[PDB]
Amino acid sequence: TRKESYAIYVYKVLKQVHPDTGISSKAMSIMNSFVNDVFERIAGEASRLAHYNKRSTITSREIQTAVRLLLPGELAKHAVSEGTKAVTKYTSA
Amino acid sequence: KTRKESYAIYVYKVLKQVHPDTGISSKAMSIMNSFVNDVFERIAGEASRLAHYNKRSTITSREIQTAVRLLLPGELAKHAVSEGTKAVTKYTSAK
Amino acid sequence: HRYRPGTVALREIRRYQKSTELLIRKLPFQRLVREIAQDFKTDLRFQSSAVMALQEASEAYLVALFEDTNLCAIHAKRVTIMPKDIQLARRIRG
Amino acid sequence: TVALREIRRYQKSTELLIRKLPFQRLVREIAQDFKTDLRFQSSAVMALQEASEAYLVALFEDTNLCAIHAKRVTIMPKDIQLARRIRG
Amino acid sequence: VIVPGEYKSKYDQCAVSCSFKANEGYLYPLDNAFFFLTKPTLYIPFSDVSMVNISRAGQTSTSSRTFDLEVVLRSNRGSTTFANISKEEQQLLEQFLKSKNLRVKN
Amino acid sequence: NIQGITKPAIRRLARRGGVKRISGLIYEETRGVLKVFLENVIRDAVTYTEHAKRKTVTAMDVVYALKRQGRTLYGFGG
Amino acid sequence: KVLRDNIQGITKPAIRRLARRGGVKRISGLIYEETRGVLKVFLENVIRDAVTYTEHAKRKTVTAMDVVYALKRQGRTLYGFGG
Amino acid sequence: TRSSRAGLQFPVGRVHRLLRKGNYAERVGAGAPVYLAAVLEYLTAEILELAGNAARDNKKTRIIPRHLQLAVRNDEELNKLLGRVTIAQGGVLPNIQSVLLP
Amino acid sequence: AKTRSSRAGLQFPVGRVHRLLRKGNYAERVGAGAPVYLAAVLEYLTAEILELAGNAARDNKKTRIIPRHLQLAVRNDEELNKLLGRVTIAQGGVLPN
Amino acid sequence: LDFLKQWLTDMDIPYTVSTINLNWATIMKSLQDDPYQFFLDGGWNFLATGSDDEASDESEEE
């Protein structure tokens, strides 16, 4: 059966951040549940913000404010910088 | 002005149904409306979560029944499921 | 008559437990809040009901924290609260 | 003195201190009250046990802190209810 | 010989469990004494029993093994407090105590 | 500013809490705690406003911020 | 059928090793039964929510997914089991 | 009308629309708004009766937030349902520790 | 290029994340700008935790990362400890103290 | 840590870095009983770990 896993991409991220390092299946499950949890947190915050400002569509602005709220300070700064760079490259392409 | 919807009319109706003499201040009514909205939001969040968890689009009465069974401390939950099952039976009877 | 130490304090405990009034003064607290909010966005205006909400939220937080502080002191077998108690309470709260 | 080590040995380890099968039987015992014929997943049993382990560990941390405030190096039960109530 | 009593505890049981010296053990009533098992095995004869008292708190958890019973023996000046008793156990013990006509302080 | 939350007022708060005797360092330390908690709430409130494209801190936004923090408030918002 | 003393299955050395992992130095005797009770209350809370999720699921097995979901309601989410 | 059909006070049709608008699901059950309106009405009834009893105790005929706070905090169940919530102007239950007393 | 994750250049799946937001009913219709930014955020967070975990593993000298390393990094780093304070990492253990 | 290491090198005192724990009590008692028994059983190199456990995983791919 197909299983919805971020693991395939998480392994790529792991090798880019640290080439020689490997991962146990247990830690890999930790990361899969981590990505699911953070995704649900940010997406839920964006949905509430869309309802709160009465917008019917989530957008990059909602996601970045959701990041600003949920993340603490330093990760919030670096995450918003990386994310705005990411939407910037995507749009410029 | 804009049309702003609050549940105050129904809160006030129920307040007569239970204690006819007593009235409700506007501030306490705002508190009660906030409580009603929060309770509905919590129950709806849990019910939608259950439907998503179990791969069921439709929010049928069973989903909200589980939500009431979960969110509330149980000694209100037993009542709340009871009146609601009664209500669904009544609505099925009527058309 | 000269009240013995502590009795008037107990009287105030009963008094302000009965009362349902704001125990921090509105304009000093509003000035304080505005001073904090200078950092995040300068020249920011406040809805007055919003300021009231910040105030009562802070009151609830400090009241519960003083309850925990007093519990810590009574656990410490000391009637007078000390800062030690406040750190202990917040550290348990986490 | 071995008591002082005995803090520091188990702190490193990732082992689950509560023995596996008595926890399984406890979990099924609690299950029986709410529903019977319930066939738990083994993964579910380990998931329960790990959370219980962490919760008790944090509780004992707060307990020892309460004792240190009291000038008592021994945890007393008053520390347990104090930590529970302040945590809420 | 001593025959076990015909007095039935909670759930038809013949004894009641409670903690002592950091150890859980049973109490068995009998014709002329209470026998507390098993470390240390303690006899409390009714004739030597001076009086008993009950201590209780007010909380929702009172229904779960909370009430306490303190007995005094005057011959040895020995006071023993019996912790961890629930509502039904306390009621059955008190019923036994009136039926035996022992002095219950309060 | 934070000094405006003065010793009589801290005593009044502590008496509402239950405290009978109060040490002197309590006032300064409590002032610090109030500073910290107010920062925590206000950051979320003003962030909510920057999303909203308003220049004022609305009480509804305050309620949403306190909801996010978990220290929910009822009555001063819908 | 019926089980008893399973909470007593939590052993005194297990409680002491827990307290030592948590940093405790000297342990009073009364700690053990109350820690047993605290563990007990936490377990009925978690198990009640999990079993409720399963009764919604129309399933006779309490999946680790439902366990995680109950813990998430309790606000003590765990990573590593299911997803 | 459906609210009369289900014999309830809180609005079944309004709850149905608002559930649809909330994006809780692609589909929203027919008895879902009925059941949810029943639950919400029961909760309002419980809180209102407890607050009214507290108001009679406090010698009032309108319920102020102090009555709501007193009801919620004194009732063990409602304290758990609304534990994190703080009621505006509600105050704290009078509770004073034993050692403090003379 | 052809695939959306490539047109962005993101590792985590832009297209799949779009599908998840669309199916989750988080809004009536999710915009096309949102999923790219979200996938970027998840990339950055996973990268941070993975770097810290590998660093802890290098102190331990073990090449593989284990949930002990994962929990050690999370608890020790103040910032990510605020992000995941309520979380418990399974078989993580407790830090020395 | 670097300052401590430089200071100890200046004092000319060999140092050890490790993570394991044993008593101080039993080592003191045994070494009063015989100052050389611990050098016989390997000296201060025993703190260095040679074989504690083995940990691994099957695989991680998809």
Residue numbers in the entry:
A (entry chain h): 29 to 121
B (entry chain d): 28 to 122
C (entry chain e): 39 to 132
D (entry chain a): 45 to 132
E (entry chain O): 369 to 474
F (entry chain f): 25 to 102
G (entry chain b): 20 to 102
H (entry chain c): 16 to 117
Provide the authors' original text about this structure.
Efficient transcription of RNA polymerase II (Pol II) through nucleosomes requires the help of various factors. Here we show biochemically that Pol II transcription through a nucleosome is facilitated by the chromatin remodeler Chd1 and the histone chaperone FACT when the elongation factors Spt4/5 and TFIIS are present. We report cryo-EM structures of transcribing Saccharomyces cerevisiae Pol II−Spt4/5−nucleosome complexes with bound Chd1 or FACT. In the second structure, Pol II has generated a partially unraveled nucleosome that binds FACT, which excludes Chd1 and Spt5. These results suggest that Pol II progression through a nucleosome activates Chd1, enables FACT binding and eventually triggers transfer of FACT together with histones to upstream DNA.
To localize FACT during nucleosome transcription, we reconstituted a transcribing S. cerevisiae Pol II−Spt4/5−nucleosome−FACT complex by withholding Chd1 from the assembly. We employed single-particle cryo-EM to determine the structure of the complex at a nominal resolution of 3.1 Å, with densities for FACT at lower local resolutions. The high-resolution density observed around the Pol II active site allowed us to unambiguously define the nucleic acid sequence register and revealed that Pol II had stalled with the active site located at bp 17 of the nucleosome. In this structure, four turns of nucleosomal DNA (SHL −7 to SHL −3) are unwrapped from the histone octamer, and the proximal H2A−H2B dimer is exposed. FACT embraces nucleosomal DNA near the dyad position at SHL +0.5 and contacts the template-strand DNA backbone with the middle domain of subunit Spt16 at SHL −0.5. In our second structure, FACT additionally binds the exposed proximal H2A−H2B dimer using the C-terminal region of Spt16, as observed previously. Comparison with our first structure shows that the C-terminal region of Spt16 has replaced Spt5N for H2A−H2B binding. In our structure, FACT only binds the partially unwrapped nucleosome, and does not interact with Pol II or Spt4/5, consistent with recent results that showed recruitment of FACT to transcribed nucleosomes, rather than the transcribing complex, in vivo. Superposition of our two structures results in a clash between Chd1 and the FACT subunit Pob3. This indicates that binding of Chd1 and FACT to the nucleosome is mutually exclusive, at least in the highly defined states we trapped in our structures.
